Structure 1
Amino acid sequence: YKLICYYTSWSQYREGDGSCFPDAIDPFLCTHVIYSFANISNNEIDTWEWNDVTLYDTLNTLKNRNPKLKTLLSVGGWNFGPERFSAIASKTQSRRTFIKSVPPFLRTHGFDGLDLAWLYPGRRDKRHLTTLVKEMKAEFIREAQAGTEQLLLSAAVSAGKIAIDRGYDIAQISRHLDFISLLTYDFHGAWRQTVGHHSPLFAGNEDASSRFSNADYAVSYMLRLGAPANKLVMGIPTFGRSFTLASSKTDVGAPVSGPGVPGRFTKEKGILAYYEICDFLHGATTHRFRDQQVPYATKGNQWVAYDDQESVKNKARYLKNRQLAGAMVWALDLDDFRGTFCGQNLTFPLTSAVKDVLAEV
């Protein structure tokens, strides 16, 4: 089993305890740590934060304590326009430029592979995304001749029935990718004026109409489209999406006025770090959709959908039962990395929970 963990660049700038650096990461927790995100300039992979080279080096020195640990650098991301990706993949000339720029970069900084986070290719991009993946892998193969261990190539893929059908040739890119991370935590939110859970595991006999927005459907669909179980990694959230209620109705379908108030540390409307949720929980009524097997909480006019230890072990048992390759966690810096916010003194409570289940049978 693989436990792929993302670490995000900007989490260094959070104040107080929210501030998180590579060295706060337990070398033995994950099997792969992914640094998000690299920029692209004059069609070449490039850094993003001013101190990326220091943090790269910090993250990669962890391989000194755990030698089996592999690290990767993710490209693209959310504040990286998909049109920007689009324009590079469609012109064989600039694509080849970017591809050739990658290996030396990873080699200089010490990464073991690249992670493609193009979010998201449209109907018009499907053909080129297939190409970028092919040629990139082809290049990683040609470079291993120099005598060094071959670089890995992975991609963070959408888990939405429509997004998959529109922009991904799943049968083609699995042959070429070392593993695929399924973004199974983006099923609600997206600005819809009703309350709902962004990452349920199951359909839930109740509000069905969506019938496609759950990890179970997403996983089953990918297997059917041609992706082999041993390359699929299922995404597990370490954050929750919040909502400001528009009425006193707290149950399913209740109306919503907009995102939830910002977290004291993460400072962004609509999402909350798990360690912030640990604190939000005191004084809140907690609930659990039993059909979907994920919790949610309320306090005043704040409604929060999140993942506790229990729901996360549950998801982990599921991927074990469908024989997937492992779990992907977004993100280490949102978990209780210090272990001083959630009660029971344990650093990385959610990621550890996943790791425990994966370490059993």
Structure 2
Amino acid sequence: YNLICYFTNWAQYRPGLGSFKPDDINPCLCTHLIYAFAGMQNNEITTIEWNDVTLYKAFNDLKNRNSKLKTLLAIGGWNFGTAPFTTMVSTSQNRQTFITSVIKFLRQYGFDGLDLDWEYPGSRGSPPQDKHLFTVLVKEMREAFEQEAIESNRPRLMVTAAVAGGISNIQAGYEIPELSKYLDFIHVMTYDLHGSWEGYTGENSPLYKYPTETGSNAYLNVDYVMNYWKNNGAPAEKLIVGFPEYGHTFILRNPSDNGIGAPTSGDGPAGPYTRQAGFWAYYEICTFLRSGATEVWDASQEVPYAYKANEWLGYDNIKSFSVKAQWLKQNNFGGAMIWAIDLDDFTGSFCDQGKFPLTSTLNKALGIS
């Protein structure tokens, strides 16, 4: 199995003990580390942070302590939008400018592949033709990587993609049978399945549907999404399950109404380290739980939730990671990917569960070490 771990180049700016850089990564935990994110300028891949080149060196130097580790560079992400991707795939010339820039960039800085994180072809303003042009891009990138390995006499650079977990976005965005022929791995973002945007409580990454859910609400679970990809053309061995090391937060309209689906208001509280409404890192979650929150196991969906006063949290813990790891193994998937290792309790001093408690759980369950 593969354990693919995302690292984010803005974690360095979090205050105090939240600050995280590549030297804080245990090189033995994952099989692949993915660097989020590169950007794009004039259809060429670029850095985005002033010290990316330094962090790239520190990131790929982790391979000096694990000969099997591979690293990839992710381009895009949610906040990158779609317009630069649309423009880049719109002509063969723009695509070749991009592919050429990617090859030089990955080889120069020491990466083993590219993770495409366009969120998403055919949605969020991307026009309908981008569904097919994404296939064209991935095929041309795969073929260019094949030819560069021949011409450079080095192992082929990998091409992977992080892909939608929402069915509407999947249907608008991906030619799954053809895409799956050229991608090395498909990183399915089976999280953010519920959150404050809905106006009621729900789990970030439930394994199964809640018993009353029907119709399109019944799409919002890991089991359905992964089987959607599998049964629409993707080989299971290429499919990687997404595991969040964070949770979503909500404000309950009434503290007495605190189950799944309870009405909520606003964007949800922010944490002192991640400082973003609606979102807590696992180490921020531990601070909340320790202060007297009520903990509930959502038995039907195999995930925990917690609440205190009018604050409600849908999240993952060791138990839920363990259940979903055994589920992905029993369904023959290629492994797991984590968003993101800088959100684990990497110091071990927030959760009293040891260093990297969530990532270590998957390392053990997937037989990584």
Same-fold status (TM-score > 0.5):
yes
SS in structure 2 at match of 1:184: coil
* Aligned equivalent of 2:133: 128
**Displacement after TM superposition at 1:208 (Å):** 3.0
Q: 1:163 aligns with which of 169, 175, 180?
A: 169
Equivalent residue for 1:305?
314
| Counterpart residue number, 1:252 | 260
Match of 1:276 among 271, 278, 284: 284
Give 5+ residue unaligned stretches, structure 1.
none
Runs of at least 5 residues in structure 2 that lack an aligned partner in the other structure: 123-127
1:32 alignment partner AA: H
| Shift in Å, 1:27 | 0.7
Distance (whole Å) between structure 2 residues aligned to residue 193 and residue 203 of structure 1: 18
2:45 corresponds to 1:40 = no
Residue 259 of structure 1, CA deviation: 2.1
- The offset of 1:124, in angstroms, is 3.2
Does 2:146 align with 1:138?
no
Aligned 1:1-361 pairs, distance under 5 A: 1-122=1-122, 123-145=128-150, 146-189=152-195, 191-209=197-215, 210-248=217-255, 249-282=257-290, 283-344=292-353, 346-359=354-367
> How far, CA to CA, are the matches of 2:287 and 2:238 in structure 1?
36
| % identical aligned pairs | 51
Change (3 A) 1:183 1:332: same
2:146 match: secondary structure: helix
Deviates more, 1:274-283 or 1:244-253: 244-253
Partner SS for 2:114: strand
Q: What is the deviation of 1:118?
A: 0.2
Say what the alpha-carbon RMSD is for the aligned residues.
Answer: 1.1
TM-score normalized with structure 1 length: 0.97
Higher mean alpha-carbon deviation, 326-335 vs 85-94, is at 85-94
Partner deviation per Cα, 1:273-302 (whole Å, 9 max, x = no partner):
000001110210011211111111101111
Provide the C-alpha distance between the structure 2 equivalents of 1:71 and 1:96, rounded to a whole number of angstroms.
23
**Distance (Å, rounded) in 2 between the aligned partners of 1:160 and 1:326:** 20
The residue identity in structure 2 corresponding to 1:328 is M
The CA deviation at 1:190 is 6.4
Q: Indicate conservation of the 8 Å contact 1:245/1:258, yes or no.
A: no
Q: CA offsets, 1:23-64, max 9 Å, x none?
A: 000010000000000010111011010000000000111111
Work out the number of aligned pairs and report it: 359
Q: Which moved more, 1:119-128 or 1:277-286?
A: 119-128
Give the SS at the match of 1:79.
helix
Contact residue 196 and residue 267 of structure 2 kept, 8 A:
no
Counterpart secondary structure, 1:211: helix
Q: 2:125 aligns to what?
A: none
Rounded to whole Å, the distance in 2 between the matches of 1:97 and 1:269 is: 38
Show CA shifts across 1:120-143 (max 9, x none): 111331011001100001100010
Instruction: Give the letter aligned to residue 51 of structure 1.
Output: N
Q: Is the 8 A contact 2:32 2:71 kept in 1?
A: yes
Contact 1:114 1:153 in 2 (8 A): yes
Amino acid corresponding to residue 63 of structure 2 in structure 1: K
